[PDB]
Amino acid sequence: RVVIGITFGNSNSSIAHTVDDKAEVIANEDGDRQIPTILSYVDGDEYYGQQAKNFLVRNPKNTVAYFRDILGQDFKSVDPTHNHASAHPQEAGDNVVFTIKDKAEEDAEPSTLTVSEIATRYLRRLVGAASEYLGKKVTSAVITIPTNFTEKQKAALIAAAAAADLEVLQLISEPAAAVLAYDASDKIIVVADLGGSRSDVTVLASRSGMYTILATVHDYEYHGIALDKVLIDHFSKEFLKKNPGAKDPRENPRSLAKLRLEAESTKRALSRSTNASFSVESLIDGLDFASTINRLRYETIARTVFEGFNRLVESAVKKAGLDPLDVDEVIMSGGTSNTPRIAANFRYIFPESTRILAPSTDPSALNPSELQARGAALQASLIQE
Numbered sequence: 001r002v003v004i005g006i007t008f009g010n011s012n013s014s015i016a017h018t019v020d021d022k023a024e025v026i027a028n029e030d031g032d033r034q035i036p037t038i039l040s041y042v043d044g045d046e047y048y049g050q051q052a053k054n055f056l057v058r059n060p061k062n063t064v065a066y067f068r069d070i071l072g073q074d075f076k077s078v079d080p081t082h083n084h085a086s087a088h089p090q091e092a093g094d095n096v097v098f099t100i101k102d103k104a105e106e107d108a109e110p111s112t113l114t115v116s117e118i119a120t121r122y123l124r125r126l127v128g129a130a131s132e133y134l135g136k137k138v139t140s141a142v143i144t145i146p147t148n149f150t151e152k153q154k155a156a157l158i159a160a161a162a163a164a165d166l167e168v169l170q171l172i173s174e175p176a177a178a179v180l181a182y183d184a185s186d187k188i189i190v191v192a193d194l195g196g197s198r199s200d201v202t203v204l205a206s207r208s209g210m211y212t213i214l215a216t217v218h219d220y221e222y223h224g225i226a227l228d229k230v231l232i233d234h235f236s237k238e239f240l241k242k243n244p245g246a247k248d249p250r251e252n253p254r255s256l257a258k259l260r261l262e263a264e265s266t267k268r269a270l271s272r273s274t275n276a277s278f279s280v281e282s283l284i285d286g287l288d289f290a291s292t293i294n295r296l297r298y299e300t301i302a303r304t305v306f307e308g309f310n311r312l313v314e315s316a317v318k319k320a321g322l323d324p325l326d327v328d329e330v331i332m333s334g335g336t337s338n339t340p341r342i343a344a345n346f347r348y349i350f351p352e353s354t355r356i357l358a359p360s361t362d363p364s365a366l367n368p369s370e371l372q373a374r375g376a377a378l379q380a381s382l383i384q385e
């Protein structure tokens, strides 16, 4: 057996392994450690990750994205909101499917593929990137999953992995994996996992080395995509003000795809510095756009989303029958937990006895985006030994 840990999310995925008792996240051949969970086909060639993400603009119909949560779902339960700008999920008997041109033709018929096949194809590429870094064929993984994954979805993921010739050793929860990454002593823990298409808040008790979940809140409205949108509307209004009579770039799918990508970029820049640029060439009707926004201004226009996150955490603690005083640690997980302001907002909500594990409010904090993959990798090694 050659084992790795895998986090497999609606927006990004990550791979990790353990060296000398320590987990390290593996960069793929694009140099990414946060690998977009997207598949795309151009001229019969298969792309995944960032190259696939980039094809959202010019090749949306043959790009499958935001499919993690669709795996194992009954078709009636599928919300295709986030697939609107890419391949649309379809009902085909008992399965949910995507119809995409994955053949070289040029007049070849489009393939109708199940989400399960999409996941298999993606996992193959994801594990392939692990194998290439290691020089050995990866055989087995621990994979992280949401706490609301149904039995059908758990089974579907296991089967999709098998079809990718990957042995699943264990499925552990996304929040559990984040706790593990921190090295894990009795305490009450809140994992605030703020992601792209979703946020999940989990309250866990640590009891004699064992974790039990006391309560969870799942939210599909307050997340990084909502933040992206704040920036998109902010700059679209600037563009329109600066270009009287020009068409609204949000109402043109191509212009909107370009705005999504740049806004995300700008957002992430503002997590590491206090000023950031936003620019798109040929945004719409041949017009270029360039502007800037500082962290203070961003936090102002994003405040309503930021307060959504507060109430999710508050809902969760109360759901567990607890009070903020009862919490010993808040672990900030997920890509959106990289946002400096959010750390500050939580540090305000919890008493000084509560600890806030985020890069800016704790000396021992880890990178929020690596927590899950690291935890998976650590669990895979514990199993191997």
Ligand SMILES: Nc1ncnc2c1ncn2[C@@H]1O[C@H](COP(=O)(O)OP(=O)(O)OP(=O)(O)O)[C@@H](O)[C@H]1O
Pocket (backbone or CB within 6 Å): 008, 009, 010, 011, 012, 013, 034, 037, 194, 195, 196, 197, 198, 199, 223, 224, 225, 264, 267, 268, 269, 271, 272, 333, 334, 335, 336, 337, 338, 339, 369
């Ligand atoms: N440095 C950063 N600052 C702010 N946001 C970031 C940063 N890095 C990543 N993000 C955001 O995190 C979100 C995705 O989080 P994560 O990588 O945990 O995704 P995921 O768990 O695969 O997503 P999903 O919630 O769709 O399952 C995106 O909206 C992305 O723009």
Ligand SMILES: [Mg+2]
Pocket (backbone or CB within 6 Å): 009, 010, 174, 193, 195, 196, 334
């Ligand atoms: Mg996630």
